[PDB]
Design an enzyme around this catalytic site. Structure first.
Site, short mmCIF file in Angstrom:
data_model
loop_
_atom_site.label_atom_id
_atom_site.label_comp_id
_atom_site.label_asym_id
_atom_site.label_seq_id
_atom_site.Cartn_x
_atom_site.Cartn_y
_atom_site.Cartn_z
CG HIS A 185 -1.89 1.24 1.16
ND1 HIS A 185 -2.79 1.44 0.12
CD2 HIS A 185 -2.03 2.32 1.98
CE1 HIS A 185 -3.45 2.57 0.32
NE2 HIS A 185 -3.02 3.12 1.45
CG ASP B 243 -4.23 5.93 3.38
OD1 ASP B 243 -4.34 5.33 2.29
OD2 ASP B 243 -4.45 5.39 4.46
CB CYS C 87 -2.49 3.09 -3.18
SG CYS C 87 -1.43 1.66 -3.56
#
Ligand SMILES: [Zn+2]
Length: 241
Positions: A115, A132, A185
């Site tokens: 991630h 994020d 991401c």
């Protein structure tokens, strides 16, 4: 969407650095993690003395590790590494790692397992921005001490307008997840930085799933019209281009 790995993200940072001369792009070789990001920031601002293993109260350009380093910093070989204002760090995380040794071993093997998030230090605005796309993927117990320790240490070096050494403000800008898959991401944080550098008050919109996909696709479709043109052959080689 094909996911973006560390090299693809770093390629976008270099692309952005051609548009924004104030942007510092960190190591093209080692991504940061929640355990390593503070040390990386302090070293890039010349606030870390590896010989005492100590944080400095003021930058010391003799501690600079940016020159003659073509593995981490080939893109800084011809820049003044001091002359930047915005420092943007891709940050890699996996929830199964609970210490630096675990996080590092895992990262070295992989950087849907990865991630990616982004920590921006903006010296002009005295802020530490954390992005994020999944909002709270990293446990607060791991990410918050790092953000707040950076903010506190940098506040002691870059004073506020009142003449005080107040901490930089920490802004964890995504409160509701915007990412809709397991893999995008790196694209999201690259789009965010793109927009942030034009408007530091930018926050991505809350969108339906299908709308978000179209939004990301629109961003991807700009990339071929935005080639890197000022990078050395050494930089292009490290980026895997
Ligand atoms: Zn330097």
């Amino acid at each position: 969407f094909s996911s973006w790995d560390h090299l693809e993200i770093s390629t976008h940072l270099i692309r952005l650095s051609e548009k924004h001369s104030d942007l510092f792009v960190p190591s093209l070789y080692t991504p940061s993690t929640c355990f390593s990001i503070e040390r990386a920031v302090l070293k890039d601002l010349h606030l870390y003395d590896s010989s005492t293993q100590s944080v400095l109260d003021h930058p010391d350009s003799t501690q600079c590790h940016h020159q003659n380093n073509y593995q981490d910093y080939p893109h800084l070989a011809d820049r003044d590494c001091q002359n930047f204002r915005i420092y943007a760090y891709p940050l890699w995380h996996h929830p199964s790692a609970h210490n630096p040794e675990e996080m590092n071993s895992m990262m070295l093997s992989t950087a849907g397992i990865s991630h990616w998030t982004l920590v921006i230090v903006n010296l002009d605005r005295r802020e530490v921005v954390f992005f994020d796309s999944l909002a709270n993927f990293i446990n607060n117990r791991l990410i918050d001490p790092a953000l707040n320790s950076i903010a506190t240490r940098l506040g002691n070096v870059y004073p506020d307008a009142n003449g005080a050494l107040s901490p930089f403000i920490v802004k964890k800008v995504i409160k509701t997840p915007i990412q809709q898959d397991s893999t995008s991401c790196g694209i999201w944080l690259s789009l965010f930085l793109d927009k942030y550098l034009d408007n530091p008050d930018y926050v991505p919109p809350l969108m339906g799933g299908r709308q978000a996909q179209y939004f990301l696709q629109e961003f991807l479709e700009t990339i071929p019209q935005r080639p890197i043109t000022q990078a050395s052959d050494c930089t292009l080689n490290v980026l895997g281009i």
